[PDB]
Nucleic acid binder design. Structure first.
Ligand SMILES: [Mg+2]
Lengths: 98, 50, 252, 252, 36, 75, 49, 50, 369, 59, 49
DNA sequence: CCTCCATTTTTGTTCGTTGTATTTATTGCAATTTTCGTGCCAATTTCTG
DNA sequence: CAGAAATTGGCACGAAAATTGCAATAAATACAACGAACAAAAATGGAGG
């Protein structure tokens, strides 16, 4: 099984799972630990943002790759915004600043 | 037909496969003798004796 | 969005998460506060000039006797409004100074630790901009709809999810309580409605932590907001620390 | 038909990341240069399996593509399999031969008391190889070979010395892949797994990283070739039972 | 500088975890005897 | 540079600074339109940068000097 | 009829037959399970069972 | 307005340095909201719209 | 006994549902026509203004792939006063060549010309078809072939080849991107003939599992239990009354439906008119004739000279039957229709007949020959 | 018992950590690896190390 | 299964760590060829329109 | 006989890795909007001179 | 090709009919199976003065 781009989840905006759904491979905590141990910061930032759930970054990365310019402009993952909304639904004021 | 690594036998201790290989060789040899007799048509007495 | 609650309701996280912050701040044991919140016993908010003092936990018969003896010379309440009144009137700097004096006067080990912890809680509350009465809910936030979608079925029909069920129960209880209160019903009914509203809000915020988990059609507990937040299937461990990615494959 | 030429053009020097689960240490992910093949299975270098804890009886691997230039350079400089020959837990090599390679290297570096071609005098390793390939000398025959070896100087330069060594045909044959700077006593014995690991570690400590990769690949090739040539098998007569077993059991 | 050594140490300790399970003095060799 | 990066690491000293320097030079050659200082032999820019660093023709100081010179020339 | 249909079609111990070969079917039909309704659970079972 | 700036505003990413957590006043909760929910009814099945 | 099915589609699931905890529903994303169009817009070397114009243009494309607002609307929606209309036209021309070709066209002639502009010049009957589409596209709609032949100055065979080439194109290019899946409806009440008379019965696809959680609260749900029973009772009674009053619609099809209203059923079932209007909406019944909404059986009426009333649906069916068998050489005008229905006792007007014909989507008499 | 409540709520006991942090009005400075992994930034180690110092000089 | 003629020996690293080396004559004779069958369904329904 | 310390009891939090779903409850008024048939006239096309 | 009939439909008219918000609405026997470590807090016993 292989995948370059496909359909995403509606709430988390992340790739789905399974071969029958043309899903992606999971990059769990232990793979993150391995990348941290190597010291590959840019590979990890690619895994976390422009390949899973940074939407504008997803589109701009695809356009840049087709354009012949291998460079990313990362943003904020959608799941963190979902987390902020879910925490604020508990009556707790959590926010970014400065 | 097939080549298998001999290094997988001694550490796993499944010695049944080696004995099965030997006995299968013996059975195929019996079959080969019968086939050789059948091809050069010989009398039924020799076939049933063997 | 938001929901306007007809009556104040305590936040279960700040009450039933050990050590209890409400109890530690009011220096009252947890069980007494739980009894008062769930409409079982009375607490005296103002001692007035009678024998009643602060935080004394009356009962129903004791309250009736107090009413017939001392009359209208005191103030005693039950429910979340009583705890809100206790928290609102209480001061912080003076309590800090008195606790410091008591700590530096008497000599012990257990009570010294208790007073140190209470002093730390009070100082933390003063340093932050928070006010203690914010630990009682009066307005309730409502999650955006696209983060709690309905479940489509065959034939072009939808089924409600768990968060929607909990929100519906809260809204129904709130509407019934508002109608009863405007209709001037007897107290023995409005108090029951208030208790059921408190239970519904507690179930919505953290289902199963207090009492028993409310189940659905599948005889299984519903998913509250805390369930979304925490666990091995929560956002942190399932989405924010690891995730599925594009440009990947697998094979033998 | 042209998209395959395009595909060969784009993957030319673009690394990929291979990962096998569970990832227990950082050597569970490694970077490789792809070679396009037919079929549906991923081919893996034999020397890295120990790092992955992988074997070819049904395992699967995931493959990821780095996109930007920084990621590609990190794959080439930090994660590539040629940068990961030493363990990070201890200082020992991890990319080391095993099984068939070890069996072949052990078999070729052995001596037999009365073997064909024993007692000859050879002008060097090439004559030993020429004799072996012609059938004129056994791989285990004890001979005398003129060996030239180099040693590093105080200022860091190699000086040569040549002498007649008592060895066997197979050890002189194996000496042709050992890089300059290592002593001949490193192969003048029957090699096992520990001896080969020691030889790789000595090569790394004396000569650096670049010769060590070449040495490891040559060792793998030679071990495979001679393990194939030996014809080593397993039979039922190989498990020899001692004759004293019956008496010992009876006495017990 | 910048190496993440805590993760390396934790992985080094944790990786081999699955291999683990779940009236008199007689001198042995020649040498002087020391007391402290 | 095609197999090992040992010479480049020795030239730059740190394996973490080498990635940054090589990425900067490769981005110059891939998008900025600069020409390689070594004979290109059907190599990618990521490998051309490392081969330039091996020969000692490129490091951070040289890149900064060339950037200042180019900016002053364009001014 | 609803109860009988539910038991035969959606119980824990009612399963699609294993049908790779005759041996799979024979093995499936002679199988004993400690799980199911009125039995143990995969996690809170024990170690001596 | 201008459509170019309108479209460019919706891809802008916030820049921050720290995360701050605290209790929420009733005024803060009201300031988050865009309206109040009064009915427990989700979808009108007789017209298929909220 | 309820009929047991003699055939069926074996269920898709082939698992043992062993896991006792499964996550919450989230859903997936879908690629519609506009998603594909925007994906193509991003990967095109536009400019900032060009990309804004393209965004505004793609916003206006409908399901069939046709532009739904004039270019002046788009130019106004841009919101910048330096931009003229020719830039919008150029961006629209560039967009119209995206896959599928012909999308975002102003009208049919434009789409057909766009599709013909892509064929190589060596296609045999290209100029003739181009001329037909460009100049005379309504003479083809009238199936004339003689005045068109008198204007195009061509023989028969060339015209036939050109028409065949024209009709091989795609009039709705944007329907290729199929993001939708055919959705269906589940009948709630089934009508079957028992003892020669039609009787109704509720569908058994619902959930009748009456259960309570006595392990531990359920008092509120006890009221919902009987609320469901009330819903079932009212639905069954209303449907039964409808079927009892309409015993002749099922037997002989249309042309026999009675002119009933909400008040009749309200009087029959002893409920308010509003309740009848609520129950008989978006609820369906299945009959050997098809699936019909309960609202389908309520209709208007017209005076009958014999002293009765005739439903409007019956008159629509009679109009359909009469028009279907008109004279092919010279069709029937509505003046003729009002005369034919007059002799039968149906006293309707002429404009009413025209309205009925319009509702049935039937071309006038001159267009039916 | 670390200075970051994000890095502590990610690990265990989310309810207790979040309650204490909300009561105390804590502020998180995003200095560890886990915090930057959560928000999808560059970790302050390896090739990202030289990046973070730059920001720490402009703050 | 099938009866295969087998030898136990190392062959140039192609049976390294539980790998199997197979002759081309095995493939030519279709000794391990299998048949797989699949079912699909189209349902013509009735709807409102 | 009181405080206070130690001890047993009570409650809470954690534990290797995928699976495919069934929700809506009504009911009686007063107001509002929607729709009905049918007339009027104006533009169309159609046949005849 | 010109001169009006025959046709069709947009627009409008009163009048019947379909569609909405908004307060009022009840409670009847069964329901399940078995986990282990470990820590922090609470309830009680008991002893020094
Ligand atoms: Mg394996």
């Amino acid at each position: 099984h292989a995948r370059s781009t496909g359909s995403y989840s509606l709430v988390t905006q992340q790739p789905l799972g399974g071969k029958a759904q043309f899903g992606g491979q999971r990059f769990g905590e232990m793979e993150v630990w391995a990348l941290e141990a190597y010291g590959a910061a840019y590979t990890l930032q690619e895994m976390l943002t422009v390949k899973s759930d940074d939407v504008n970054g997803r589109t701009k990365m695809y356009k840049n790759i087709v354009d012949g310019n291998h460079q990313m402009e990362p943003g904020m993952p959608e799941s963190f915004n979902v987390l902020l909304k879910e925490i604020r639904s508990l009556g707790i004021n959590i926010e970014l600043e400065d | 037909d097939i080549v298998l690594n001999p290094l997988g036998v001694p550490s796993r201790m499944n010695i049944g496969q080696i004995l099965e290989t030997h006995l299968g060789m013996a059975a195929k040899g019996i079959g080969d003798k019968i086939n050789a007799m059948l091809k050069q048509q010989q009398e039924v007495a020799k076939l049933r004796e063997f | 969005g938001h929901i306007e609650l007809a009556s104040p309701t305590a936040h279960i996280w700040f009450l039933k998460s050990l050590p209890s912050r409400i109890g530690l701040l009011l220096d009252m044991p947890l069980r007494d506060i739980e009894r008062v919140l769930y409409f079982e016993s009375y607490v005296v908010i103002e001692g007035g000039m009678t024998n009643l003092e602060r935080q004394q936990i009356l009962t129903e018969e004791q309250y009736l006797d107090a009413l017939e003896e001392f009359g209208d010379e005191f103030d005693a309440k039950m429910g979340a409004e009583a705890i809100q009144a206790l928290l609102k009137s209480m001061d912080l700097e003076q309590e800090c100074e008195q606790l410091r004096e008591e700590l530096n006067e008497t000599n012990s080990e257990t009570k010294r630790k208790k007073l140190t912890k209470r002093i730390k809680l009070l100082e933390a509350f003063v340093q932050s901009g928070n006010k203690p009465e914010w630990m009682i809910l009066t307005v309730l936030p409502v999650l955006p709809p696209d983060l709690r979608p309905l479940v489509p079925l065959d034939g072009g029909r939808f089924a409600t999810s768990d968060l929607n069920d909990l929100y519906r129960r809260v809204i129904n209880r709130n509407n019934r309580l508002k109608r009863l209160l405007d209709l001037a019903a007897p107290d023995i009914i409005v108090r029951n409605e208030k208790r059921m509203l408190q239970e519904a809000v507690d179930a919505l915020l953290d289902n199963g932590r207090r009492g028993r988990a409310i189940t659905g059609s599948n005889k299984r507990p519903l998913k509250s907001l805390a369930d979304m937040i925490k666990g091995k299937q929560g956002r942190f461990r399932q989405n924010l620390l690891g995730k599925r990615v594009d440009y990947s494959g697998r094979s033998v | 038909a042209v998209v395959w030429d395009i595909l060969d053009e784009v993957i030319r020097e673009h690394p990929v990341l291979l990962n096998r689960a569970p990832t227990l240490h950082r050597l569970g992910i490694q970077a490789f240069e792809p070679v396009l093949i037919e079929g549906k299975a991923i081919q893996l270098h034999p020397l890295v399996c120990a790092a992955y804890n992988a074997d070819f009886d049904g395992d699967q691997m995931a493959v990821h593509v780095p996109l930007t230039l920084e990621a590609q350079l990190e794959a080439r400089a930090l994660m590539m399999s040629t940068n990961n020959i030493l363990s990070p837990a201890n200082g020992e090599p991890i990319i080391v031969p095993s099984q068939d390679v070890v069996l072949g290297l052990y078999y070729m570096t052995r001596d037999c008391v009365n073997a064909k071609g024993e007692g000859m005098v050879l002008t060097g390793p090439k004559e030993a190889e020429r004799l072996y390939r012609s059938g004129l000398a056994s791989l285990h025959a004890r001979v005398k070979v003129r060996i030239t070896e180099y040693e590093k100087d105080a200022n860091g330069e190699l000086v040569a010395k040549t002498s007649l060594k008592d060895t066997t045909v197979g050890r002189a044959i194996l000496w042709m892949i050992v890089p300059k700077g290592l002593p001949y006593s490193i192969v003048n014995q029957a090699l096992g797994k520990k001896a080969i690991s020691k030889m790789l570690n000595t090569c790394y400590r004396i000569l650096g990283l670049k010769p060590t990769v070449i040495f490891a690949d040559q060792i793998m090739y030679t071990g495979f070739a001679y393990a194939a040539r030996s014809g080593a098998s397993v039979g039922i007569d190989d498990m020899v039972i001692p004759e004293k077993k019956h008496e010992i059991i009876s006495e017990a | 500088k910048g190496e993440a050594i805590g993760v390396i140490a934790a992985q080094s300790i944790g990786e081999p975890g699955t291999q683990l399970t779940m009236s008199s003095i007689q001198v042995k060799n020649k040498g002087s005897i020391k007391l402290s | 540079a095609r197999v090992t990066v040992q010479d480049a690491v020795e030239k730059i000293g740190n394996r973490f600074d080498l990635v940054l320097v090589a990425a900067r030079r490769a981005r110059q050659m891939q998008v900025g339109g600069k020409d390689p200082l070594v004979p290109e032999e059907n190599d990618k820019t990521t490998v051309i940068a490392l081969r330039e660093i091996e020969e000692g023709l490129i490091n951070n100081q040289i890149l900064d000097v060339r950037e200042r010179q180019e900016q002053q020339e364009q001014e | 009829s609803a109860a009988v249909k539910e038991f035969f079609g959606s119980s824990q111990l009612s399963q699609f037959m294993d049908q790779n070969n005759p041996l799979s079917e024979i093995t499936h039909k002679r199988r004993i399970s400690a799980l199911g309704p009125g039995g143990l659970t995969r996690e809170r079972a024990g170690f001596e069972v | 307005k201008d459509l170019l700036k309108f479209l460019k505003a919706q891809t802008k990413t916030e820049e921050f340095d720290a995360i701050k957590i605290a209790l929420a006043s009733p005024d803060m909760i009201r300031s988050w909201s865009f309206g109040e929910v009064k009915k427990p009814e989700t979808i009108n099945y007789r017209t298929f719209k909220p | 006994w309820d009929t047991i099915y003699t055939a069926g589609t074996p269920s898709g699931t082939s698992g043992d549902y062993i896991d006792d905890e499964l996550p919450v529903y989230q859903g997936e994303t879908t690629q519609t026509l506009q998603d594909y169009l925007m994906w193509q817009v991003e990967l095109t070397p536009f400019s900032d203004t060009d990309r804004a114009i393209a965004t505004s243009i793609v916003d206006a494309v409908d399901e069939t792939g046709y532009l739904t607002v004039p270019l002046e609307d788009i130019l106004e929606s841009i919101g910048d006063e330096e931009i003229d209309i020719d830039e919008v036209e150029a961006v629209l021309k560039r967009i119209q060549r995206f896959d599928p070709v012909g999308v975002a066209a102003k009208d049919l002639r434009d789409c057909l010309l766009i599709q013909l502009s892509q064929f190589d010049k060596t296609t045999p009957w290209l100029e003739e078809a181009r001329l037909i589409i460009s100049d005379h596209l309504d003479l083809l709609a009238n199936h004339d072939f003689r005045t068109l032949m008198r204007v195009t100055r061509l023989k028969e065979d060339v015209l036939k080849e050109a028409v065949n080439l024209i009709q091989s194109l795609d009039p709705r290019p944007g329907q290729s991107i199929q993001t939708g899946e055919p959705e269906y409806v589940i009948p709630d009440v089934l009508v079957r003939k028992h003892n020669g008379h039609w009787t109704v019965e509720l569908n058994s696809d619902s959930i009748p599992r009456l259960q309570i959680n006595q392990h531990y609260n359920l008092q509120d749900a006890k009221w919902l239990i009987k609320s469901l029973e009330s819903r079932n009772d009212t639905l069954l009674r209303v449907s039964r009354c409808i079927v009892e009053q309409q015993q002749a619609f099922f037997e002989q099809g249309e042309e026999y439906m009675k002119p009933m209203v909400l008040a009749d059923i309200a009087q029959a079932v002893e409920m308010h008119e509003s309740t009848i209007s609520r129950v008989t909406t978006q609820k369906y019944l299945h009959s050997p004739r098809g699936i019909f909404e309960l609202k389908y059986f309520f209709s208007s009426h017209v005076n009958t000279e014999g002293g009765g009333e005739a439903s409007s649906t019956a008159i629509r069916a009679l109009v359909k039957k009469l028009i279907a068998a008109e004279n092919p050489a010279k069709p029937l005008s509505d003046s003729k229709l009002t005369s034919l229905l007059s002799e039968q006792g149906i006293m309707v007007a002429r404009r009413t007949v025209a309205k009925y014909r319009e509702s049935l989507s039937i071309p006038p008499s001159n267009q039916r020959k | 018992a670390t200075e970051s409540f994000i890095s502590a709520a990610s690990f265990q006991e989310t309810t207790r950590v979040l309650t204490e942090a909300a009561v105390a009005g804590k502020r998180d400075e995003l200095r560890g690896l886990k915090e930057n992994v959560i928000v999808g930034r560059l970790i302050p180690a390896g090739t990202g190390y030289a990046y973070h110092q730059d920001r720490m000089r402009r703050r | 299964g099938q009866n295969m003629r087998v030898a136990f020996m190392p062959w140039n690293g192609y049976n390294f760590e539980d790998s199997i080396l197979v002759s081309e004559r095995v493939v030519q004779e279709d000794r391990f060829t299998t048949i797989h069958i699949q079912e699909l369904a189209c349902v013509s329904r009735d709807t409102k329109l």
